[PDB]
Structure 1
Amino acid sequence: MGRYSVKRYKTKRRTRDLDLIYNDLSTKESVQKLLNQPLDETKPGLGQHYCIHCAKYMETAIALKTHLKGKVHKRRVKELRGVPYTQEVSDAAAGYNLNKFLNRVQEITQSVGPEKESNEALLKEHLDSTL
């Protein structure tokens, strides 16, 4: 419709999205896969130096030091604090599947929550020790 919004938000130039990124942090196995990708020729940092929050490859290990100390990367940390807004939140707002909704909110409060925060604590423990 506009000029600026078409340039960044076409179907071709779509980023990953906020839904999958919360799944990648939520367990300890998918974190170790993305921190240790096999090196690929068709990827900007040759398949290393990948930030998990912002689905984005960096060129150099220097470009992670300057990326984490920025207001752009402190969006996505503050963005991924809570429940990740699935389809189930929108259905519960109309009076439809509360018990499917409230049980998932019960699990993010109990189980999935402190497993995520004990993963994001270890990323700052690791990305400061190597950089």
Structure 2
Amino acid sequence: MGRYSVKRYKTKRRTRDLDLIYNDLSTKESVQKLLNQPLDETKPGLGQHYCIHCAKYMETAIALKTHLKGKVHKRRVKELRGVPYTQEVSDAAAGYNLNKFLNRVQEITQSVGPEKESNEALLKEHLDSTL
């Protein structure tokens, strides 16, 4: 309706979203798939220098050092902390599928949580060494 929301938030100009980015950090395979992508000509960094949290390609390796030291990227780290808000959070609020929802909160607290927190802890060690 306004001017500014139509500029950034059309359907054409949409980012990935907060659901799929949590699944990428959930395992060790897709961490190493997205870091070590094959070079592609259409993509901005020629298929290199990609941040996993902010799904965004960086041009130069110097453009990661300035990106990781900033309030934009610290924002997306804090955004991905809790349970990633699937559809099941919306239906459990109405009084519908608790045990489907209660098992997911149980697994993410026990199993997937500290495995994701280990995978992010190795990204900060990996991007430190290459840069």
TM range (shorter): over 0.9
Report the alpha carbon displacement of residue 56 of structure 1 after superposing the two structures with TM: 0.2
Report the alpha carbon displacement of residue 44 of structure 1 after superposing the two structures with TM: 0.2
CA-to-aligned-CA distance 1:4-61 (integer Å, 9 cap, x gap): 0000000000000000000000100000000000000000000000000000000100
Q: What is the identity percentage for the equivalent residue pairs of Structure 1 and Structure 2?
A: 100
Name the counterpart of 1:80.
80
> Normalized against structure 1, the TM-score is what?
1.00
CA distance, structure 2, for counterparts of residue 11 and residue 124 of structure 1? 32
CA distance, structure 2, for counterparts of residue 47 and residue 108 of structure 1? 32
Report the alpha carbon displacement of residue 3 of structure 1 after superposing the two structures with TM: 0.3
Report the alpha carbon displacement of residue 75 of structure 1 after superposing the two structures with TM: 0.6
Question: What SS does structure 2 have at the residue aligned with 1:29?
Answer: helix
CA distance, structure 2, for counterparts of residue 38 and residue 107 of structure 1? 33
Could you list the runs of 5+ residues in structure 2 that have no partner in the other structure?
A: none
Could you list the runs of 5+ residues in structure 1 that have no partner in the other structure?
A: none
> Normalized against structure 2, the TM-score is what?
1.00
Report the alpha carbon displacement of residue 81 of structure 1 after superposing the two structures with TM: 0.5
Asked if residue 128 in structure 1 is aligned to residue 116 in structure 2, the reply is no
Report the alpha carbon displacement of residue 111 of structure 1 after superposing the two structures with TM: 0.2
Once superposed, which parts of structure 1, at least 4 consecutive aligned residues long, lie more than 2 Å away? none
Question: What SS does structure 1 have at the residue aligned with 2:94?
Answer: coil
Q: How many residues align?
A: 131
Cα RMSD after superposing both structures = 0.3
CA distance, structure 1, for counterparts of residue 3 and residue 126 of structure 2? 41
CA distance, structure 2, for counterparts of residue 55 and residue 126 of structure 1? 18
CA distance, structure 2, for counterparts of residue 30 and residue 15 of structure 1? 18
Name the counterpart of 2:100.
100
Question: What SS does structure 2 have at the residue aligned with 1:74?
Answer: helix
CA distance, structure 2, for counterparts of residue 102 and residue 3 of structure 1? 42
Report the alpha carbon displacement of residue 103 of structure 1 after superposing the two structures with TM: 0.3
